[PDB]
Each structure stands twice: as C-alpha cells, then as structure tokens.
Design an enzyme around this catalytic site. Sequence first.
Site, short mmCIF file in Angstrom:
data_model
loop_
_atom_site.label_atom_id
_atom_site.label_comp_id
_atom_site.label_asym_id
_atom_site.label_seq_id
_atom_site.Cartn_x
_atom_site.Cartn_y
_atom_site.Cartn_z
N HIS A 230 -79.03 -2.38 -2.49
CA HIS A 230 -79.76 -2.33 -3.73
C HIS A 230 -81.67 -2.94 -3.91
CE1 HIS A 230 -78.42 -6.42 -5.43
NE2 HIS A 230 -78.84 -6.58 -5.06
N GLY B 91 -81.14 -14.17 -8.01
CA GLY B 91 -81.95 -14.81 -7.64
C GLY B 91 -81.30 -15.45 -6.53
N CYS C 209 -79.06 -13.10 -4.95
CA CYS C 209 -78.72 -12.10 -4.13
C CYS C 209 -79.00 -12.13 -2.45
CB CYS C 209 -79.23 -10.51 -4.45
SG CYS C 209 -77.86 -10.37 -5.78
N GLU D 55 -72.28 -1.15 -0.19
CA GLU D 55 -73.61 -2.45 -0.02
C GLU D 55 -74.37 -3.35 0.98
OE1 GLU D 55 -74.53 -1.87 -3.05
OE2 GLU D 55 -75.89 -3.28 -3.88
#
Length: 182
Positions: free
Chosen positions: A41, A146, A148, A72
């Site tokens: 992402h 914050g 990730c 991901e």
Amino acid sequence: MGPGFDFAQAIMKKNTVIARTEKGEFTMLGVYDRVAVIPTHASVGEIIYINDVETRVLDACALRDLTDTNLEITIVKLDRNQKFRDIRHFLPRCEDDYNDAVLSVHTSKFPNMYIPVGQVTNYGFLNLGGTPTHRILMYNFPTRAGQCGGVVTTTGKVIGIHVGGNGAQGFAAMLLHSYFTD
C-alpha cells in the site's frame, strides 16, 4: 531493556532506512545487497526517497501467493551506492506462531520506537482495507498510523513487517526466506 529489544535494536541500527512515497513515510527493512521490503500500500513508483535522498527504483514486485492472493509485501531493488548487511539467515523458512515479539519503527514521526507486542498468531486470511490478504501475523497491541513497515522480530528471527490494525489488534505480513533466494 532485555534480549528481545537487543536483537530488535541490532536490526534497526544496520538494516533500516526511512522510505518516502506519495502515500507517506515508512520504516523500510533492507534484507541483502540493495534489496529491501515495504508494504504494498506504499505504492512504490519509479523514484522513492531513502533517508530524504532521491533514489531510482531498479525493480519493484508486489508479491502474491500461488492462489493469486495479495501478500502485502513489495520487494524493492534500490539504485543505492551501498549494500545492506545480509540478514537472510534470520528469516523463517515456514509459516509459524511466535512468543514474545517486538515491533520496531523508525520514522521522522516515531524515531527509535520499540513495542513489546507479546504472542504472535499465524492468523492467515485478513480482509485488509477491503483486499483479501494471506500469511498475516496478528498481535494484541493497539497499533496506530505511522507504524506501517515496522519490523517484527523475536530473538534471532525477523518474522514480518507491520501492514495494518483494527484499533485493538495489529497485523504483519510474513517474511519467508524463500522470498529472497537468488
């Protein structure tokens, strides 16, 4: 404070950079040579900022399992003049549950941040922001925006990168040794 935080600090001090895309600042784990990982992402493009320096992306691959399900993890090769310490021998070979993990973050907003998250479950399937996702680890800590890209470790193992939360639980994508064979 103890041997978990020791291993986490040794990884942060040598094997992380601050990555900036158009979608934010992320902790980024360097794995070997000029190869690093980041949550998919983050939407990595042709150019990324690495410690506030404009860096060409030589390759970026958003990983999916053999059922064509999102994992991901994006593997990025950076046009950087320096290699990472090779930490592939700290990567698990198989999907697993863990005890006593630490989540470590380093950004402009959260420098030198370490969180003892406790027990980590092989959760498996997660609908992550609307996207079916596999190989998810879960810990019962109220993680926030914050975190990730944050690195999940136990003593002697680098097991995942933080990719989301629901306010009460946090979720990481597994790192497996097989992602980084060459």
